[PDB]
Structures are given as structure tokens and as C-alpha cells.
Amino acid sequence: GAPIHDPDFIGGIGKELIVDNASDVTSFYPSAFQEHLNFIPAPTTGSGCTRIPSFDMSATHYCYTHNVILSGCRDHSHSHQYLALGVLRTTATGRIFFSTLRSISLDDTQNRKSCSVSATPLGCDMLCSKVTETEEEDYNSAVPTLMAHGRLGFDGQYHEKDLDVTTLFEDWVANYPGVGGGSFIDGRVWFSVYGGLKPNSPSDTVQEGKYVIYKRYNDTCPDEQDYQIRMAKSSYKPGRFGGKRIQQAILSIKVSTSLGEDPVLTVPPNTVTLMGAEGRILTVGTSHFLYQRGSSYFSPALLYPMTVSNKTATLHSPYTFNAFTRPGSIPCQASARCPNSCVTGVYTDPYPLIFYRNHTLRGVFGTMLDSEQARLNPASAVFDSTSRSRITRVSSSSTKAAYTTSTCFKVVKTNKTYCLSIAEISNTLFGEFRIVPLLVEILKNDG
Amino acid sequence: GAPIHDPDFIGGIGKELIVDNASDVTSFYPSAFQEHLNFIPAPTTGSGCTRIPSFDMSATHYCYTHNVILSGCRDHSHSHQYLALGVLRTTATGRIFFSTLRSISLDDTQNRKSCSVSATPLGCDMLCSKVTETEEEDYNSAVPTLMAHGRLGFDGQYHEKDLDVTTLFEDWVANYPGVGGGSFIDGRVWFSVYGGLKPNSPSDTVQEGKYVIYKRYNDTCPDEQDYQIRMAKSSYKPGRFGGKRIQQAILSIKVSTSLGEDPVLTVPPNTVTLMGAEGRILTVGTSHFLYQRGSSYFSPALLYPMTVSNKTATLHSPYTFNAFTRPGSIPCQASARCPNSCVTGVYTDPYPLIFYRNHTLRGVFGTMLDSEQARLNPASAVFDSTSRSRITRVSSSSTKAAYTTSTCFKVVKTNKTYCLSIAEISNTLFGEFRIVPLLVEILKND
Ligand SMILES: *[C@H]1O[C@H](CO)[C@@H](O[C@@H]2O[C@H](CO)[C@@H](O)[C@H](O)[C@H]2NC(C)=O)[C@H](O)[C@H]1NC(C)=O
Ligand SMILES: CC(=O)N[C@H]1[C@H]([C@H](O)[C@H](O)CO)OC(C(=O)O)=C[C@@H]1O
Ligand SMILES: CC(=O)N[C@H]1[C@H]([C@H](O)[C@H](O)CO)OC(C(=O)O)=C[C@@H]1O
Ligand SMILES: *[C@@H]1O[C@H](CO)[C@@H](O)[C@H](O)[C@H]1NC(C)=O
Ligand SMILES: *[C@@H]1O[C@H](CO)[C@@H](O)[C@H](O)[C@H]1NC(C)=O
Ligand SMILES: *[C@H]1O[C@H](CO)[C@@H](O)[C@H](O)[C@H]1NC(C)=O
Ligand SMILES: [Ca+2]
Ligand SMILES: [Ca+2]
């Protein structure tokens, strides 16, 4: 007797939404923002800071979560998490609405940060880092970061179990969940995780010399082939964190009544993965993907084809979407084209929207920050490997924003495809940010 | 197996919060706004209009609802309602949070407006008006307004039944729920309702000549005793709605598995009630009250002691709170003192906070719009019949706002008293209004 989306959605959750080999990907564009039940709590005070949204929806229910800090976004002493478990439903008039069933404020003696959620058969699994020190400090402290695998059950109850980080993340100095949603695959919950490796440790040595250069489609890097390789090698040991190696990883835990059961860490060779960064494990149809935040020199949205075997994962040459850029700081700005060492960017993910009959991904939906360096102007659109469709803006005026996580689905009864685009938009009176669940219907020029 | 607030609240919901005969009412003041789980949905588009909040909380669960219009607050063609049923809970750290259990968007072929909710043993009872015409138009059409008694059950299901308005509101030209929350009393759900009476109908004739003047404490009306009486008589048949009589009423329906079972309308004599307006039926302890919006000449917050017998109600000389004023248009502005004909004001209710050991009400909490004519500057405070305590402002800058509905309770485990103040505040980017659940802890000097 577990909760399940209204019958109108059956067959429309987590599948390849648009199969077409003929049409141009960019002929599909988002509608004007749709008005629906806002399920994401806004701040209630002049300085409350709600940030870091994580979302995932299975074929049965959805999971959402965000961090809350009482005094401001800068304060690092303590915070709590908002957690929601729910199911998609429709009005008599066929309007959709995310109907949450368990709504809670998680607040105890611990400071959970960079939290990620996943919709598993047992509820809303969550992966957080319990931190006492700042990011800069955690990297310096050679000991791994404390992590916990929690879960909001259908009964509205929350249980968690700290992970044995001293053994699991033994070769790590710092480790955090990718904030983007995790995914449930073959009896296991998969989470994106990044952090810093202990220099000269087994895990660090194997990644030594390993690098890879991903380029821009239309642009070409003028730098010499030797300079570039030297730059790529160094983009993995950037300045910001004392030249430590920021590694990308994937943790899989067995979904059972025992939290933290059988955790297994996978560290993909850097011959394929760029510098570790926030991420998300997506599952669309039978395909799996790894979104990786563009924290390094690469600007275009990345999606590493992910395939699982047993308890480990394997990544492949990523899909890139040239028009889906993210603001960054020089020399890693939106229009950057050459390899370099940096740690900037912002989390704005791409949701697999349009596929080929052969099942190879063609296009994606997402909300990008349409700006070179400043986190400004959120713009929702559909993207292929090279161009961008018609867009939908939050405001024609310059607007401050941050992270965005998108997820598309179809109401089979109305035969309409929608994309939920959760975005951190600036606010007034009540806090620095208001995380708003934007909604668009995916349209096509003709029919 | 119905939902119930976490054990930390048992004994702290709907009771007299502060019993003290010694202390000055205004020594109790609200804290700085507290940060808690915002359970009220904000607009998701640049023009979505969320307005008209109604809230009520029983000893077991709470009910909330608001109207939503896609294009703007002005558009009257169609709209839907957001409905929530939930229970109060506490974090490990003792922070409170309204945890909703059933969250829904109610949208069908009908246009429900001016909706009111009440927490009954069967769920969240709702009273709405299904309208096709504008307010101005409804008053002109001699036929009563269509009403429905709905309910969001614990199972997350919504059922409703249209009321036989042609018989129930037979002597009425227009009728709407008071938007403020309704209350559950003696197996019946009680709703505040106002509207217009059919001229020369039985109900209208009895109210003819009936009036009453409520005055300001410190101020005195210069007008002659004859002019005032003539003005009071006319304040009941104001201009705005074609000189029709705007009457205040109270509808009670039996709470059962059959919606709309045994509806009974009570129309109190105007020798006690002012011109009909939005309202709320409050139940605090063993006492009952009727809040009546200051739509007429009276500015101070009103609370008519309400007593029930059988299926009808009876009102008594209202408690008035002189510092708890509401912005209005001349000559019925915040500082008005003389009887006059008008239909303005705004809904900003007072929640019974501090009582005497004898049980007579002494003070109330609420969020007033601190301004003479414009709906501006929300200010939360504690009030007695004459003064106002220290306040808590949403912003030091001039701020646009509208309705506010407050409800206080105590977390017995932490021995802290809180007041939830639901207020319509202006917004940017996403719609004209954002209905935010402000929260304050009631403090005392020392
Ligand atoms: C309990 O005592 C209070 C005062 O402590 C009573 O309030 C007074 O009531 C009389 C009634 O004639 C008024 O004249 C006074 O103005 C009231 N005093 C104040 C300070 O308000 C109250 O009436 C008593 N309870 C009841 C039910 O009568
Ligand atoms: C654990 C942590 O501090 N994460 C922070 C993240 C981090 O700086 C980046 O991923 C490089 O490590 O960036 C930002 C941000 O708004 O951009 C906010 C997060 O709280
Ligand atoms: C049924 C209806 O129209 N109610 C409206 C109400 C009404 O006009 C007033 O109570 C005079 O009767 O006023 C207001 C308002 O923001 O001021 C909002 C309500 O939508
Ligand atoms: C079809 O899929 C194959 C691999 O499965 C891929 O190489 C090809 O690009 C896809 N479609 C087209 C038109 O090439
Ligand atoms: C009443 O108001 C007057 C004029 O504003 C003021 O001077 C006086 O102090 C008040 N009187 C009392 C008894 O409060
Ligand atoms: C390639 O890059 C240029 C900028 O040099 C850009 O203006 C152009 O749109 C891109 N080509 C296509 C087909 O989009
Ligand atoms: Ca460390
Ligand atoms: Ca009518």
C-alpha cells in the first residue's frame, strides 16, 4: 500500500519522452511558465537562507530537499534540512500538481550539508555530509568527511546511519554528495559524490597523469598541444583547495531496511571524467547518466553515459551541449574554450528529453544561467549538441539566480509533456533566495 | 486512526494561552519573526494571483486554503483553490513546523470564491460561493448566490454538496462566506457569512430601523446625536452596492458523512451587529467569538462574544481594540471616529491571547496594517482595549500588503507560546501577492 502517482501519469515517469529521428531538436521549445501548486517552501524571515535543492522522481513517488540556515547564506555554524515525499496528481481540469505526503523539518545536533535525495522503493533516500569545518578547512584536514545515509519513509519517519568514512573514503581528505538527485538502480541507490583525494594515496596515484580534454564544437583552442595537456593535468589539482586532487566518484548503497548496507565506492579514471564537481545520477528509460557540474574549464552541460554492473559503475565519453553554458570566472567563463585550472561554475543540469529510435540521446531540457561570468538570467530551453531553442525567461530584467535542477515527465491522459525546473532565484523581503519550481510544457512548432 | 499533532502540543491548541490578572496586557510583545517550514504555496509565474487565505486549527489538525487565479488578481472568469490538511510537529531541536498531510489543487468547472475552512472531526470542512457574476453583478441579481459545503478528508479526498440557496438564503440577493476560518462546535461547523438582503423581504424588514453606534475610546464624535443616528441607519445600506442592506449572518451545518446536512442560518439583530462584512468564528477555551471585518465606519478590531444554543447563535456587545485599526477610505479611515456610510477596510483579525481568571478576554494578538488609508505596513503586536505593545515589522520600508489571519498556540514541552500570522504581502517576479505564514514567539519583559 505504498503511495503512487495518480493513474494519469502511469507510463509517463522516467521514460524517454520524445522519440523522433526526423525533427530538429530545437524545433521543440518550452511554453510560458505554467502556474501550479508550489511545493517548495519559501523563507519566512528577512534573512532565512534556503538553498541547495535536490530532486528525484521514480515511477511511484518524488523526493525533494533543501538546506536552511537561519541567519544568512554565509553562516556556516548550523542548519537544517527540509524534506518532502510526494506523488504527482491532476485536477479535474487536468492541471498537474506535486502533492506532498510527508513534509518535515529535519533538525538535530548535526549539520547536514550538500544533501542528495533519491526515490527508492522504501521512500526518499538521502545522502548528506555532516560537517563541523568549512569547505576550505575540510580539505586541509587529512581525515575524510563524515557522511550519512538517511531515509524519509512513507510513514513520515526519518532514520539514518553514519557511514564508516574512515574505511570507505580512506584515501580522501574531503568528500560530499553531488547535491543533484541520486537514482535507484538494481536494488541499489546511486549517488554522485566528489571531493579531494589524499595526496600520494593509492587512489591518488592511479589518477596521476590521467586527464582528458573536451573541446567546444564551433570554437578551437589556439594554445599549443603541449600547453593544453599541461593545463588539463593541472585542472585536477586547482589552486582553491591547496592543490589537492578534486576527484569525481559514485557511491552505491543497497536499498534495504538497514541504512548504509553494503556501501561501494566507484572512482572512474580521469581519462574520461573531468575535475570532480557536484552532480546527479539520472535514469531515463533503460539509460543512465551522470551530470557533472562545470566547475572546471569546460562550460557546456555534460552527461556521461553511465552503465552499471554489480555494485560499481562505468562512465563513457560524455554528451556535450554547446549552447547550454554556465557562468564562470575567467579564464573558465561561459565562452571559455581552452583547458585551465579553476573551480567555479554553477549547478544547472540537463534532463534527457529527445532520443533517437536507436536510443542514443539527441536533446535535453534545462534552465541555464544566460550570462558570461555573473550568476544571472535563468533561461529555460531545449538543447542539442550545438544549438538552443526558443527560450522562456523568468524576467526580461537582469536577475540574480543560482542552481537549477530539471526533470521532465508526461501526463499520458492529456498527452502533454512537462519539465519541472527547480531554480534558486533571488528574493526580496524574505531571505536572499526563493527556490521556485518552474514549470513548462514542451511544445513543437507544428503538428 | 485520524492524524494528530505531535505530543508536544497536546493541551496547547485552542485554549486560553495566557491567564494573568496582574500584568499589563501590553507588557507581552511579539519576538522577531521566526523561521519555520513555509506551508503556504507561493506563485510560480509572473502573474499568478494567490489570495484570500482561510485558516483554522482544532485540537487535532489544521486546515488552510487560498484562491488562485492564473492571469492576475483582477481576472474574475475562473480560479481554483489550494487546500491543505495537516498537523503541528516539532524537530529534535524543538523548532515547530506545520506538517501538511493532504496537499491539493481543487480545480473543476466551477468557480469557488471567498472560501472558508474549519477543522472538524471528519477533516477540513470548506464553505465556498460558486459565482458566475462579479460582486457588483451578484448584488443586482435578486437571486441568492450559489453556495457549497465541501470537505477535504483525512484520506486526501474532496467531496462537496451544493446548498439549497433558493430556500436557505431566500431573502438574500448576494451571500458569501466570511473568508476567515470557521469553527467546530457541538457537532456542528459554524461559518461566518455576509451579503445583501432582498429589500422588503421578511429578513430585511426586521433589520429596518435597527442600528448601533460603537465609539472610539479616547476620541469623541462632534456630530449631533441626531445626525449620527441617521448616519448609522444608512451605514447598513451603503452606496457601493445599490443601497442594498449588507447583513451579517452565521450559518451552522451538522458535521456528518453527508455534506450540507441540516443547514441553519442565524441573523443577529443589527442593534448589536454592524454592517455585514468578512469574518471568522473563533473558539478559544470555552469561549466563542465572531470577528467582523471593519468594512464600515468602525476601525478598531471587533470580537463579538458568541454563545451557541441548539443550532443557532447569539452575539453580544463586542470587545474593541482601539490601537488595532485598519486602513480605510475617507471618511472611514483608520482614525475615523464618527458613524458613516461606506464599504472599505481590510481583513486583519485578532486572536484571543490573554484572559482574566474569570475568563473575560483582556488582550489579543494580530497583524495590523499600520496606515491610515493605504493597505500598507503590516505590524504584528499584542493589543488590549486601548493600547498596542512593542511591534514587529515585515520591513522598515513602506510595504504593500492585504489580509492577515492570526492563530496562537503553545508547545507545552518547551513552554513557549506562538502566534502564526498568515499575511498577504506584496511580491516581485512571481505574482502580485505571496501569502506568507509569519511566526512570532510571545514574550514578556521581565
Ligand atoms: C472578572 O474581573 C474583571 C476585572 O478583573 C471584570 O472586569 C470588569 O468588569 C466590570 C463589569 O461591571 C467592568 O465595569 C470593568 O470595567 C471591568 N474591568 C476591567 C479592567 O476590564 C470582569 O467583569 C470579571 N468577569 C466577569 C465575567 O464579569
Ligand atoms: C560543500 C559545499 O560547500 N558546497 C558549496 C559548492 C562548492 O563551493 C563547489 O561545489 C566547489 O566545491 O558551491 C556553492 C555554490 O553556491 O556555488 C554552494 C555549496 O554549499
Ligand atoms: C466576494 C468578494 O468579492 N470578496 C472580496 C471582498 C469584498 O469585496 C468585500 O468584503 C466587500 O464586500 O474584498 C476583497 C478585498 O481585497 O478587499 C477581496 C474579496 O475577493
Ligand atoms: C543511432 O544509434 C547509433 C548507435 O546506436 C549512433 O551511432 C547513431 O548516431 C544514431 N543515429 C544516427 C542518425 O546516427
Ligand atoms: C487621548 O488623546 C489625547 C489627544 O491625542 C492625548 O493628549 C491624551 O493623552 C489621551 N488621553 C488619555 C486619557 O489617554
Ligand atoms: C558557433 O560559434 C559561433 C561563435 O563563434 C556562434 O555565433 C554560432 O552560432 C555557432 N554555430 C552555430 C551553428 O550555432
Ligand atoms: Ca577532512
Ligand atoms: Ca444574486
PDB file of N, CA, C and O in Angstrom, chain A residues 148-179:
ATOM      1  N   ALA A 148      26.415  10.342   5.974  1.00  0.00           N
ATOM      2  CA  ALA A 148      25.312   9.557   6.497  1.00  0.00           C
ATOM      3  C   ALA A 148      24.299   9.288   5.408  1.00  0.00           C
ATOM      4  O   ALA A 148      24.029  10.134   4.549  1.00  0.00           O
ATOM      5  N   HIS A 149      23.777   8.073   5.441  1.00  0.00           N
ATOM      6  CA  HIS A 149      22.776   7.621   4.511  1.00  0.00           C
ATOM      7  C   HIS A 149      21.457   7.597   5.288  1.00  0.00           C
ATOM      8  O   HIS A 149      21.238   6.728   6.145  1.00  0.00           O
ATOM      9  N   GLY A 150      20.594   8.570   5.003  1.00  0.00           N
ATOM     10  CA  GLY A 150      19.312   8.645   5.681  1.00  0.00           C
ATOM     11  C   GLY A 150      18.147   8.252   4.802  1.00  0.00           C
ATOM     12  O   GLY A 150      18.338   7.886   3.637  1.00  0.00           O
ATOM     13  N   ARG A 151      16.938   8.332   5.363  1.00  0.00           N
ATOM     14  CA  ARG A 151      15.717   7.999   4.634  1.00  0.00           C
ATOM     15  C   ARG A 151      14.403   8.472   5.267  1.00  0.00           C
ATOM     16  O   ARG A 151      14.146   8.215   6.448  1.00  0.00           O
ATOM     17  N   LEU A 152      13.582   9.173   4.479  1.00  0.00           N
ATOM     18  CA  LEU A 152      12.266   9.599   4.937  1.00  0.00           C
ATOM     19  C   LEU A 152      11.349   8.499   4.416  1.00  0.00           C
ATOM     20  O   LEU A 152      11.246   8.298   3.206  1.00  0.00           O
ATOM     21  N   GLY A 153      10.737   7.754   5.334  1.00  0.00           N
ATOM     22  CA  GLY A 153       9.864   6.650   4.963  1.00  0.00           C
ATOM     23  C   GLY A 153       8.462   7.090   4.639  1.00  0.00           C
ATOM     24  O   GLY A 153       8.073   8.210   4.965  1.00  0.00           O
ATOM     25  N   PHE A 154       7.699   6.215   3.991  1.00  0.00           N
ATOM     26  CA  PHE A 154       6.321   6.530   3.619  1.00  0.00           C
ATOM     27  C   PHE A 154       5.483   6.876   4.850  1.00  0.00           C
ATOM     28  O   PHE A 154       4.504   7.630   4.760  1.00  0.00           O
ATOM     29  N   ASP A 155       5.897   6.335   5.996  1.00  0.00           N
ATOM     30  CA  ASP A 155       5.221   6.563   7.264  1.00  0.00           C
ATOM     31  C   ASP A 155       5.521   7.954   7.858  1.00  0.00           C
ATOM     32  O   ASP A 155       4.992   8.322   8.911  1.00  0.00           O
ATOM     33  N   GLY A 156       6.364   8.718   7.169  1.00  0.00           N
ATOM     34  CA  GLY A 156       6.717  10.047   7.630  1.00  0.00           C
ATOM     35  C   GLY A 156       7.870  10.080   8.605  1.00  0.00           C
ATOM     36  O   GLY A 156       8.218  11.134   9.134  1.00  0.00           O
ATOM     37  N   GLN A 157       8.482   8.923   8.814  1.00  0.00           N
ATOM     38  CA  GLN A 157       9.592   8.799   9.738  1.00  0.00           C
ATOM     39  C   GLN A 157      10.956   8.885   9.085  1.00  0.00           C
ATOM     40  O   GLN A 157      11.146   8.387   7.979  1.00  0.00           O
ATOM     41  N   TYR A 158      11.906   9.504   9.785  1.00  0.00           N
ATOM     42  CA  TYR A 158      13.270   9.636   9.281  1.00  0.00           C
ATOM     43  C   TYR A 158      14.292   8.832  10.089  1.00  0.00           C
ATOM     44  O   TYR A 158      14.389   8.968  11.315  1.00  0.00           O
ATOM     45  N   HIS A 159      15.062   8.011   9.384  1.00  0.00           N
ATOM     46  CA  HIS A 159      16.102   7.202  10.007  1.00  0.00           C
ATOM     47  C   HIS A 159      17.368   7.357   9.183  1.00  0.00           C
ATOM     48  O   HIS A 159      17.309   7.520   7.956  1.00  0.00           O
ATOM     49  N   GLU A 160      18.512   7.326   9.855  1.00  0.00           N
ATOM     50  CA  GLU A 160      19.783   7.430   9.163  1.00  0.00           C
ATOM     51  C   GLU A 160      20.851   6.636   9.889  1.00  0.00           C
ATOM     52  O   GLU A 160      20.676   6.228  11.039  1.00  0.00           O
ATOM     53  N   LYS A 161      21.946   6.392   9.184  1.00  0.00           N
ATOM     54  CA  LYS A 161      23.075   5.653   9.719  1.00  0.00           C
ATOM     55  C   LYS A 161      24.356   6.295   9.184  1.00  0.00           C
ATOM     56  O   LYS A 161      24.489   6.511   7.980  1.00  0.00           O
ATOM     57  N   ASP A 162      25.265   6.668  10.079  1.00  0.00           N
ATOM     58  CA  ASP A 162      26.519   7.270   9.660  1.00  0.00           C
ATOM     59  C   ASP A 162      27.309   6.227   8.894  1.00  0.00           C
ATOM     60  O   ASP A 162      27.221   5.034   9.195  1.00  0.00           O
ATOM     61  N   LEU A 163      28.035   6.655   7.870  1.00  0.00           N
ATOM     62  CA  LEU A 163      28.840   5.720   7.094  1.00  0.00           C
ATOM     63  C   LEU A 163      30.247   5.645   7.685  1.00  0.00           C
ATOM     64  O   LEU A 163      30.730   6.607   8.290  1.00  0.00           O
ATOM     65  N   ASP A 164      30.888   4.490   7.527  1.00  0.00           N
ATOM     66  CA  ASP A 164      32.242   4.264   8.027  1.00  0.00           C
ATOM     67  C   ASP A 164      33.219   4.967   7.073  1.00  0.00           C
ATOM     68  O   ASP A 164      33.984   4.311   6.368  1.00  0.00           O
ATOM     69  N   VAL A 165      33.204   6.298   7.075  1.00  0.00           N
ATOM     70  CA  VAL A 165      34.058   7.074   6.182  1.00  0.00           C
ATOM     71  C   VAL A 165      35.548   6.837   6.311  1.00  0.00           C
ATOM     72  O   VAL A 165      36.280   7.019   5.340  1.00  0.00           O
ATOM     73  N   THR A 166      36.005   6.425   7.490  1.00  0.00           N
ATOM     74  CA  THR A 166      37.438   6.180   7.693  1.00  0.00           C
ATOM     75  C   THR A 166      37.956   4.969   6.925  1.00  0.00           C
ATOM     76  O   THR A 166      39.169   4.808   6.750  1.00  0.00           O
ATOM     77  N   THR A 167      37.031   4.136   6.458  1.00  0.00           N
ATOM     78  CA  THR A 167      37.363   2.946   5.681  1.00  0.00           C
ATOM     79  C   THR A 167      36.874   3.089   4.238  1.00  0.00           C
ATOM     80  O   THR A 167      37.586   2.731   3.292  1.00  0.00           O
ATOM     81  N   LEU A 168      35.668   3.635   4.078  1.00  0.00           N
ATOM     82  CA  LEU A 168      35.054   3.833   2.766  1.00  0.00           C
ATOM     83  C   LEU A 168      35.747   4.939   1.968  1.00  0.00           C
ATOM     84  O   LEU A 168      36.053   4.764   0.790  1.00  0.00           O
ATOM     85  N   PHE A 169      35.966   6.084   2.606  1.00  0.00           N
ATOM     86  CA  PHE A 169      36.635   7.210   1.958  1.00  0.00           C
ATOM     87  C   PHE A 169      38.041   7.403   2.531  1.00  0.00           C
ATOM     88  O   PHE A 169      38.517   8.528   2.688  1.00  0.00           O
ATOM     89  N   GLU A 170      38.703   6.278   2.805  1.00  0.00           N
ATOM     90  CA  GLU A 170      40.051   6.234   3.381  1.00  0.00           C
ATOM     91  C   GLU A 170      41.108   7.068   2.660  1.00  0.00           C
ATOM     92  O   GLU A 170      41.935   7.709   3.304  1.00  0.00           O
ATOM     93  N   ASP A 171      41.090   7.055   1.332  1.00  0.00           N
ATOM     94  CA  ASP A 171      42.066   7.818   0.560  1.00  0.00           C
ATOM     95  C   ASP A 171      41.584   9.236   0.254  1.00  0.00           C
ATOM     96  O   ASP A 171      42.138   9.900  -0.616  1.00  0.00           O
ATOM     97  N   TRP A 172      40.590   9.717   0.998  1.00  0.00           N
ATOM     98  CA  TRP A 172      40.034  11.053   0.757  1.00  0.00           C
ATOM     99  C   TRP A 172      40.245  12.040   1.891  1.00  0.00           C
ATOM    100  O   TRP A 172      40.175  11.670   3.059  1.00  0.00           O
ATOM    101  N   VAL A 173      40.457  13.304   1.541  1.00  0.00           N
ATOM    102  CA  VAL A 173      40.641  14.352   2.539  1.00  0.00           C
ATOM    103  C   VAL A 173      39.304  15.061   2.795  1.00  0.00           C
ATOM    104  O   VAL A 173      39.040  15.549   3.896  1.00  0.00           O
ATOM    105  N   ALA A 174      38.477  15.121   1.754  1.00  0.00           N
ATOM    106  CA  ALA A 174      37.163  15.762   1.798  1.00  0.00           C
ATOM    107  C   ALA A 174      36.246  15.053   0.804  1.00  0.00           C
ATOM    108  O   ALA A 174      36.684  14.667  -0.279  1.00  0.00           O
ATOM    109  N   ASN A 175      34.981  14.883   1.176  1.00  0.00           N
ATOM    110  CA  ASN A 175      34.012  14.208   0.322  1.00  0.00           C
ATOM    111  C   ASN A 175      32.591  14.660   0.597  1.00  0.00           C
ATOM    112  O   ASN A 175      32.168  14.748   1.749  1.00  0.00           O
ATOM    113  N   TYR A 176      31.855  14.957  -0.468  1.00  0.00           N
ATOM    114  CA  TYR A 176      30.479  15.426  -0.345  1.00  0.00           C
ATOM    115  C   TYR A 176      29.588  14.878  -1.448  1.00  0.00           C
ATOM    116  O   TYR A 176      30.070  14.527  -2.520  1.00  0.00           O
ATOM    117  N   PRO A 177      28.275  14.771  -1.189  1.00  0.00           N
ATOM    118  CA  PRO A 177      27.336  14.267  -2.196  1.00  0.00           C
ATOM    119  C   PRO A 177      27.253  15.343  -3.285  1.00  0.00           C
ATOM    120  O   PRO A 177      27.521  16.515  -3.008  1.00  0.00           O
ATOM    121  N   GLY A 178      26.871  14.962  -4.505  1.00  0.00           N
ATOM    122  CA  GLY A 178      26.802  15.924  -5.601  1.00  0.00           C
ATOM    123  C   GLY A 178      25.635  16.895  -5.622  1.00  0.00           C
ATOM    124  O   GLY A 178      25.525  17.695  -6.536  1.00  0.00           O
ATOM    125  N   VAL A 179      24.832  16.879  -4.563  1.00  0.00           N
ATOM    126  CA  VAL A 179      23.621  17.697  -4.382  1.00  0.00           C
ATOM    127  C   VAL A 179      22.515  17.395  -5.385  1.00  0.00           C
ATOM    128  O   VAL A 179      21.344  17.393  -5.022  1.00  0.00           O
TER     129      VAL A 179
END
